[PDB]
Amino acid sequence: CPLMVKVLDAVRGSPAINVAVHVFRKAADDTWEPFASGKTSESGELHGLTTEEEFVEGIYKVEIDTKSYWKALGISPFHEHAEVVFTANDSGPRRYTIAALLSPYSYSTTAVVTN
Amino acid sequence: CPLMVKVLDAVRGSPAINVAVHVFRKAADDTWEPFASGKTSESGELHGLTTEEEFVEGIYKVEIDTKSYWKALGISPFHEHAEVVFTANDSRYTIAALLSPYSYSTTAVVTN
Amino acid sequence: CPLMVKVLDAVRGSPAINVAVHVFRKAADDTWEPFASGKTSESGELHGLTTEEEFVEGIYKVEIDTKSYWKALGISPFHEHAEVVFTANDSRYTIAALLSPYSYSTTAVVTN
Amino acid sequence: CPLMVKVLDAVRGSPAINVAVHVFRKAADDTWEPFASGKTSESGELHGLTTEEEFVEGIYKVEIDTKSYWKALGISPFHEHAEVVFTANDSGPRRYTIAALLSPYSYSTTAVVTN
Numbered sequence A, D: 001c002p003l004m005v006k007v008l009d010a011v012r013g014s015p016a017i018n019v020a021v022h023v024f025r026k027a028a029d030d031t032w033e034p035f036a037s038g039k040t041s042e043s044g045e046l047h048g049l050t051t052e053e054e055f056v057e058g059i060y061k062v063e064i065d066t067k068s069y070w071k072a073l074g075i076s077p078f079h080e081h082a083e084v085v086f087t088a089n090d091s092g093p094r095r096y097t098i099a100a101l102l103s104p105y106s107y108s109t110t111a112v113v114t115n
Numbered sequence B, C: 001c002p003l004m005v006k007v008l009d010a011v012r013g014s015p016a017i018n019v020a021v022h023v024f025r026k027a028a029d030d031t032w033e034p035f036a037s038g039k040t041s042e043s044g045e046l047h048g049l050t051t052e053e054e055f056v057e058g059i060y061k062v063e064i065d066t067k068s069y070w071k072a073l074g075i076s077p078f079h080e081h082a083e084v085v086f087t088a089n090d091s092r093y094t095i096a097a098l099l100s101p102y103s104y105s106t107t108a109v110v111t112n
C-alpha cells in the first residue's frame, strides 16, 4: 500500500465515509491520465489504490470529491473538490499518506511520507 | 495595538462575530490573571485589547469562547473553548483562529 | 475588487511574500483559461485581480506556486502547488491559504 | 482505549515522535487534577492513557508539549503548548481520538468521536 488517503469531517467529528477519490498521473505529453480511483470506507480510509510496481516516479494528482460529500449532507460547500498535487518517488520508493480534514468552507491536507 | 485576534467560521465561510475572547497573563505565583477581553466585531476581529506600554514580555493565554458561538447557531461543538498560550518576547502579534464544531486551527502572524 | 487572496507561512509566522498566484476560469470546452495573476505583497495579500464586471458566475481555479516559495527558503516541500477550485455564484470572496512544507489549509471567507 | 492522541509534524511530513502529553480532569473544586500522561510513539500515537472504568464523565484537558518538541529540532516555536479542552462521556461512554497537526507558528486539532 504505497498510497493511502484518509479523510475526516470537521463538522461531525467523524471519518468522511463514501468520499470519491480520483488519482491521476501526469503523462509524457503533460496531460493528466487516470491512475486509480476509489471511495473512502467507514473508517474514512482508502487503501489499495495501487501497488509498488505500478506506482512509478511521476507527478500525481489526488482529487477528493468534497462537493458531493457535503451536498449529500444538505450543505452547500464552497469548493468543487480538494486537489493534492505532488512529485512521488523521485529519490526511490516511498509510502505516502494523504490526509484531508474537511469543512464546508475550508479544508486542510497533509502528507505523511515514510520509507 | 501590539495584539490582535481574528476568528473565522469554517462552516459558514464568514467572520465569527460576537465571540467572547479573554486574555490572561501568567502571574508570579503561576496563576492566570485577567488582562484583557472583548467580543469579536462584524469582521471577526478584536482590536485595542492592549497597548505597547502594558504588553510586557511574559506568558499570555488567549481564550476564545467557541462553545457559546456554536450553541448560538444550534450546533453541538466538541471543545469547551480554544486556548492559545504563548510567550511575548521583544525584538505585532496577530492570533488567528479558524473554527469548526470538532476542529480548530490557530496561527500566529508576527510582523515588523 | 470581489476576489482577494491571502497567503500565510506557518513555519515562520509571517505573510508569505512574493508568492505567485494564477487564477483560471473554466471555459466552454472544459479547459482552464488564464484569468488573472500576480505575486503576493509584503502583507501576503493579492488585491486587484479582477473587477465586478469581469467576475461573472463560473468555476474558477486559484493556483498558488507554493513549491517556488519553499525552495527560496531552502526547504524541500511536498506539494507542486496549492489549488483552490470553486464556483462563484451571485447573491466578496477572500481565499486564504496557510502554508507548511507538507501541509496546507485553505479557507474561503465570503462576505456582504 | 477510549482516549487516543495522534500528533503529526507538518514541517517534516512525519509523525511527531516523543511528544509529551499530559491529561487533566476538572475536579469538584474546579482545579485541574492530573489524570494521565505519556509520550507519543514512533507512529506519533499515544495509546493506553486510560481505561473505560476510569474515564468517567467530566471536563478533560489534553496538553501537548509542542514547545519541547520544536526546541529539540532547533526551531523556536510560537506556542508554549497546545491545549484541547472538552466534556467527555456526558451522554454515555464514547471513544475519543484527539489529533493534532503541528507547525512552529500554527497548529490544528480535531476530534474523532465514535461509539
Ligand SMILES: Oc1c(Cl)cc(-c2cc(Cl)c(O)c(Cl)c2)cc1Cl
Residues within 6 Å of the ligand: B006, B008, B094, B096, B097, B098, B105, B106, B107, B109, C006, C008, C094, C096, C097, C098, C105, C106, C107, C109
Ligand atoms: O486575515 C487572515 C485571514 Cl483572512 C485568514 C487567516 C487564516 C487563519 C487560519 Cl487559522 C487558517 O487556518 C487559515 Cl486557512 C487562514 C488568517 C488571517 Cl490573519
Ligand SMILES: Oc1c(Cl)cc(-c2cc(Cl)c(O)c(Cl)c2)cc1Cl
Residues within 6 Å of the ligand: A006, A008, A097, A099, A100, A101, A108, A109, A110, D006, D097, D099, D100, D101, D108, D109, D110, D112
Ligand atoms: O490518522 C489520522 C488522524 Cl486521526 C488525523 C489526521 C489529521 C489530518 C489533518 Cl488534515 C489534520 O489537520 C489533523 Cl489535525 C489531523 C491524520 C491522520 Cl493520518
